[PDB]
Symmetry: C2
């Protein structure tokens, strides 16, 4: 439904804007899935116990379905950016979406490398909080942006996507793979993939932080939205973590500590608020363009 082109504006694009800096970062730090050596993970995998394989398969399942979900569910944000006339942010989000596709790809390649070929949905059957987040909260909230690209809708969506799903859940998951792999010096392919996905995620989270901060600065009502949505989801995220532990008698393999993981995740969620609240009362110019 088009009238003008952002790329043709006087002065061009502002390469110093956050989304364009992130885009350039993603270009400089682009990594190739074909560069990750998976040829050693199967040997480690076969040496694990049944329980250890079960746990790691279930963690992997949660990951790859989550990547897939974000790949799909990020799309309405691109639409919102277009509605706001923010080409640089739209550009950034194309990279974001591509990266999530590539995350989906690399987990799939790891699964293939370790010999996993069965339907994995069964690993989500007993994780109702997971399904509530990834099959309901995330798509429903993101999809709202198609009809309502308002600052309030953006903030709600960014909380769900960037601050909870990435900021709380994915980071806690990376910590889980850390606990599984590092001290035992196993699964070097997984380890490498997690490092690289982590690196991409740093940018995705920077974008989400930026997005909430600029709306918060512009209108303190958006702080309301932020705080409310965070407080709604933190317990649901924590329930996901709890349900996962419960399936293993709260004593999973790899010596994972339920209390450690709840503390970690809580910290990750809690630390989010401060990072946004600092935008309150700031000239939007100090935050944006």
């Amino acid at each position: 439904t088009r009238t003008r082109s952002g790329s043709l504006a006087a002065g061009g694009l502002n390469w110093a804007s956050l989304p364009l800096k992130l885009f350039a970062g993603g270009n400089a730090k682009f990594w190739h899935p074909a560069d990750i050596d998976f040829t050693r993970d199967r040997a480690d995998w076969e040496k694990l116990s049944d329980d250890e394989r079960d746990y790691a398969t279930r963690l992997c399942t949660q990951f790859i379905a989550g990547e897939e979900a974000v790949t799909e569910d990020i799309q309405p944000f691109m639409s919102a950016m277009r509605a706001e006339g923010r080409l640089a942010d739209e550009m950034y989000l194309t990279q974001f979406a591509f990266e999530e596709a590539k995350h989906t790809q690399v987990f799939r390649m790891w699964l293939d490398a370790v010999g996993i070929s069965e339907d994995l949905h069964r690993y989500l059957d007993d994780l109702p909080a997971y399904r509530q987040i990834f099959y309901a909260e995330l798509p429903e909230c993101l999809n709202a942006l198609s009809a309502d690209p308002s600052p309030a809708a953006q903030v709600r969506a960014s909380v769900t996507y960037n601050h909870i799903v990435e900021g709380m859940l994915a980071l806690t998951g990376y910590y889980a793979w850390h606990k599984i792999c590092v001290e035992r010096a196993i699964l070097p392919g997984m380890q490498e993939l997690v490092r690289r996905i982590g690196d991409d995620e740093r940018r995705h989270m920077a974008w989400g932080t930026f997005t909430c901060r600029r709306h918060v600065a512009a209108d303190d009502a958006n702080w309301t939205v932020f705080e409310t949505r965070m407080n709604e989801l933190i317990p649901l995220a924590l329930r996901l973590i709890e349900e996962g532990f419960a399936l293993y008698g709260d004593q999973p393999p790899f010596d994972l500590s339920k209390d450690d993981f709840l503390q970690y995740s809580t910290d990750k969620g809690m630390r989010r608020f401060g990072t946004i609240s600092n935008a309150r009362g700031r000239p939007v110019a100090e935050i944006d363009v």
Copy 2:
């Protein structure tokens, strides 16, 4: 609105499917905008005549606005792929969209390198066919997919996007930059950018070809759709080319021949049909999955 996850299916993803082969290709052949040396183009640029700069600025304007448009307008196709349950195609399209963003980026960097900072919309004022394609036909047709992800809607959208805008117009534009730059051995940064964008475009067009072929094979009614939409747009594309020549008295700089360019573009459009018509009557298995 989610129920299952494609990434969790028995047997995983099919790495041999066309969209996944293209995705892997795009990963292997990823190019960095920061690798293109632009530091020599300004010197060449300043040696051109006013007329030559005018013509090339207008060609560049058409390009970068077109990249921007496709970056934006590809999005509804991702939605259609999701509706069809085709995760591999969705994945591919994230890469496609990212690449168009990066195309937009690199043309913007070239403009900056040559010292162009004015608002460029004025270069489109006298190109009404351009505006009709890029501001009306392309967004309207693509946007239809949001509400109607049917095979017929997909085919119409793919004709507009892949077969006309890329297949006919962009290819003719690459030929224009070839005529401008190669024999004179100028603008090595432009030349390099055009080669790299060309390489990405080969994949985008492969995807569009695949998409039309699989719907055509599945139902010959989709051949109707294809043929009709092509025949509707070819004259509009040719009018775009004509209007561009007319502004320069049908004798632009760089010794460009109107008749040569009309023949080239016509050939590019015409050659499209055969590539799709061969899918008629074929088992879809010979074309897809």
